[PDB]
């Protein structure tokens, strides 16, 4: 009765989930929704068990009583003696990325430029940059700051969706799932790369994984890191190798959430699913890799090395951290 129902956001995640479902012998099966918020509702109704969320979505889910269960953990250096499953998580760097050739764009000259955001309510793509901008401007009018944006999940007719491209048919403009061409870390970095926007709010790892041949994908295969700079909060611009001194925040890793009443079962099932399909899994690369989707970050980030146990059975507030939680609260006072 530890069949776990995974919630897949949009059709491409649904398709990966189906392949996992098949390979797991139906130990995992799939519910699908059009948006992460709808997936959280399925979970609240007990029609789905679990999904992996960005931190801004953990805030939504945790306000509704869902709880973190295991965290994404990626490649490390300190704690290298520890198994991935037991290693604490280190968070990721939220950065603002621009074209090196867009000279004299700084953090301080962002007003009226064109932005690319991973999705509204996400950590690096939205709560951190807009939280900081609202704070620095003294103004809740975050929808008037950038001239045009792609911020998937905003009103499709608003300027915050103007740059979004929708799917290969032009349908679904600005839907917050991977059907939207500019959705997600990779979508928003693509919106910069193709110069639809002036600035992408993604994380440090995005830049590296879609540059210098790390991605074979047609829009990314020719990008060189040297053509990009980070915007530091002090007004300077740095190379993308300096993200440790040039970021907007350290974000809590993406984590699996579930209803509390199902958390222990979801954990057990996932720990065994990743022994089969995770990074050195018995059946990956052979049959299925849970943490691969050709750079589209479907269900989990493709840079995930394992899902790791959480120290201290944290509540969603403890997992997010008090400072991040309050930053999210404060920003939400605007809208």
């Amino acid at each position: 009765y530890t069949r776990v129902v995974w919630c897949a956001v949009g059709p491409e995640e649904q398709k990966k989930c189906q392949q996992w479902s098949q390979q797991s012998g139906q130990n995992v099966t799939c519910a699908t929704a059009s948006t992460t918020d709808d997936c959280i509702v399925l979970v609240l109704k007990g029609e789905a068990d679990a999904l992996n969320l960005d931190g801004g979505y953990i805030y939504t889910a945790g306000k509704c009583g869902l709880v973190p269960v295991l965290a994404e953990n990626r490649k490390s250096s300190k704690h290298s003696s520890l198994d991935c499953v037991l290693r604490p998580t280190e968070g990721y760097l939220a950065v603002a990325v621009v074209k090196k050739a867009n000279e004299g764009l700084t953090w301080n000259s962002l007003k009226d430029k064109k932005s690319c955001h991973t999705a509204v309510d996400r950590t690096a793509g939205w709560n951190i940059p807009m939280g900081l901008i609202v704070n620095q401007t003294g103004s809740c009018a975050f929808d008037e700051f950038f001239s045009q944006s792609c911020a998937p999940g905003a009103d499709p007719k608003s300027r915050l969706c103007a740059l979004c491209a929708g799917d290969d048919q032009g349908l679904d403009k600005c839907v917050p799932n991977s059907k939207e061409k500019y959705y997600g870390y990779t979508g928003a970095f693509r919106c910069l790369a193709e110069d639809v926007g002036d600035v992408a709010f993604v994380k440090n790892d995005t830049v590296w994984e879609n540059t210098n041949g790390e991605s074979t994908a047609d829009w990314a295969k020719n990008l060189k890191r040297e053509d990009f700079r980070l915007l530091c909060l002090d007004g300077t611009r740095k190379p993308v190798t300096e993200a440790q001194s040039c970021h907007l925040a350290v974000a809590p890793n993406h984590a699996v959430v579930s209803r509390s009443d199902r958390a222990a079962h979801v954990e057990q099932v996932l720990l065994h699913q990743q022994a089969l399909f995770g990074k050195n899994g018995k059946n990956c690369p052979d049959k299925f890799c849970l943490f691969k989707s050709e750079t589209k970050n479907l269900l989990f980030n493709d840079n995930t090395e394992c899902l790791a146990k959480l120290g201290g059975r944290p509540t969603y507030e403890e997992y997010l951290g008090t400072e991040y939680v309050t930053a999210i609260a404060n920003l939400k006072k605007c809208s």
Binding site: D37, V41, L44, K63, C64
Partner: peptide, 6 residues
């Protein structure tokens, strides 16, 4: 300040 958005 507090309560589920659904």
């Amino acid at each position: 300040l507090e309560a589920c958005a659904f």
